[PDB]
Design a protein around this ligand. Structure first.
Ligand SMILES: Cc1cc2nc3c(=O)[nH]c(=O)nc-3n(C[C@H](O)[C@H](O)[C@H](O)COP(=O)(O)OP(=O)(O)OC[C@H]3O[C@@H](n4cnc5c(N)ncnc54)[C@H](O)[C@@H]3O)c2cc1C
Length: 456
DNA sequence: CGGCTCGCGCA
DNA sequence: TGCGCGAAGCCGAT
């Protein structure tokens, strides 16, 4: 589809047809950014060879009622900044409200689009929208992987059992797909208010707000500034101040040594390929670079491999055969404790370490990467069944995490509860052969009293 | 067959 | 804190 700096393996055809005489339409969803976006670049390249302008369309769905204000404001404020960025490049952006299966097909017919492009997401609801759009349009429909360094359908053609089998496949394709991004050329031709959608949506989510006793909100919004510009600053400070000590202080929740990039990486406000490009060129601790590259490349893209090849990624059926047989045998085991969804949500357990972990989630929207393991595994230990544990963890993870509703979450929860991408460990009660984490094990690895005292 | 992103005993 | 071992089931390189 033309291009010199454009690898054709990044784009695949969802529907064939005669290319219309209208503008090229980029259905933006996962990658909400103007820079370092292969989908927006491939849309501009197709627009250049056809001598037509490119436009961006974003469909705001009713999915925001399932989450809260913390994710709604973080995403909508970045789209307000993105609207100004695309305007400087003469790219007009259109924001629709409703079902994408019906709104995109109507926008395509109304604007007389010539070609339709969208980004890649392995989630179930995205494939449902794509099949609805294919049946309602008659122009070519393409899909570009702008979230992974190596395209998901190109890195592996099957479900990967572990990371030690996915690691050689990914790193073998890095010299081809790891490249610099070309600049977004502005439009040569020419062709709802986001402020009202923000005030309307916030007023609908106000009753469901997380509060404390004196009716004060629990969420602290000053920890992470949303937007494409702020995501660049978070990367720069991480490379300059936090990348050196990353390899040694990554599992210490009392130290702020993480990249803090998952809120921006989830909404697509920053390209993970851009982060890899800068980390590769940075002269820092070699063990710290290898530890970070293993996270943002192997573990981030293998979660896309998990959801894309297992349509029941949020279910007990996606668990391996050894894990399902172990969890099934311990179904009748008496639990030491039993808490419901409301008691897990308010942090009213007997474990001050688990409660402090839940408080960091409710107040900042980003639980530390290490405690999220202990947070999820203790749910399986103090719940009715593995299905209820999977249901409570997914609920709290997608409702209060800023990086929630992400393929990393369903793969991370399945790792902690179902042992996905893990192996079997010592036999125990209730949990069986699933990996076990203890409060005493965290006491020997970091100052637990400091973590508890920080979040009450 | 070899090696996989815990708890535990011991410097 | 840092290291070596234990307990476990299975992939995949042959
Ligand atoms: C039960 C559970 C639930 C999770 N929930 C989510 C979620 O909803 N959204 C989410 O983005 N991550 C989730 N993860 C992964 C992990 O908790 C976050 O990626 C990380 O804590 C975010 O902080 P960070 O970006 O500063 O981490 P860093 O150490 O800076 O990691 C850098 C990047 O690497 C990737 N990464 C790191 N660790 C993992 C991992 N274990 N799996 C996959 N990718 C990883 C992420 O893209 C992250 O932004 C979850 C993990 C677990 C165990």
């Amino acid at each position: 589809p033309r291009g010199s700096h454009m690898n054709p393996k990044r784009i695949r055809a969802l529907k064939s047809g005669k290319q219309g005489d209208g503008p090229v339409v980029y259905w933006m969803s996962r990658d909400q950014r103007a820079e370092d976006n292969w989908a927006l670049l491939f849309s501009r390249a197709i627009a250049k060879e056809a001598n037509v302008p490119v436009v961006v369309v974003f469909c705001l769905t009713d999915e925001f009622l399932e989450a809260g204000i913390r994710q709604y404001e973080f995403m909508l404020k970045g789209l307000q900044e993105l609207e100004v960025s695309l305007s400087r490049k003469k790219i007009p952006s259109f924001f629709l409200r409703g079902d994408p299966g019906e709104k995109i097909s109507r926008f395509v017919k109304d604007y007389n689009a010539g070609t339709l492009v969208t980004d890649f997401s392995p989630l179930r609801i995205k494939n449902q929208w794509i099949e609805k759009v294919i049946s309602g349009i008659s122009i070519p429909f393409f899909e570009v992987d702008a979230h992974n360094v190596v395209p998901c359908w190109e890195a592996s053609q099957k479900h990967e059992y572990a990371a030690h089998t996915f690691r050689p496949k990914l790193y073998a394709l890095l010299p081809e797909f790891l490249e610099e991004f070309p600049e977004l050329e502005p439009n040569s031709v020419t062709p709802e208010t986001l402020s009202d959608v923000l005030e309307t949506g916030v007023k609908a989510l106000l009753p469901e707000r997380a509060l404390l006793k004196n009716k004060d909100p629990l969420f602290e919004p000053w920890h992470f500034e949303p937007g494409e510009k702020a995501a660049k600053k978070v990367m720069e400070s991480f490379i300059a101040d936090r990348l050196d000590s990353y390899g040694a202080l990554r599992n210490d929740p009392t130290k702020n040594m993480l990249s803090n990039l998952s809120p921006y990486l989830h909404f697509g406000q920053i390209s993970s390929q851009r982060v890899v490009l800068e980390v590769e060129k940075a002269e820092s601790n070699p063990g710290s670079k290898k530890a970070f590259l293993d996270e943002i490349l192997i573990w981030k893209e293998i979660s896309d491999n998990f959801c894309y090849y297992n349509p029941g990624y949020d279910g007990f059926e996606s668990f391996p055969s050894w894990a399902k047989e172990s969890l099934n045998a311990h179904r009748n085991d008496v639990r030491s404790h039993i808490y419901t969804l409301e008691e897990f949500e308010a942090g009213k357990t007997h474990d001050p370490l688990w409660n402090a972990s839940q408080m960091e989630l409710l107040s900042t929207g980003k639980m530390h990467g290490y405690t999220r393991m202990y947070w999820a595994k203790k749910i399986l230990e103090w719940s009715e069944s593995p299905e209820k544990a999977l249901e409570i963890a997914i609920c709290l993870n997608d409702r209060y995490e800023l990086d929630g509703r992400d393929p990393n979450g369903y793969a991370g929860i399945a790792w902690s509860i179902g042992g996905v991408h893990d192996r079997a460990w010592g036999e125990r009660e209730v949990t069986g052969k699933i990996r076990y984490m203890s409060y005493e094990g965290c006491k020997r690895k970091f100052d637990v009293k400091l973590y508890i005292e920080k979040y009450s």
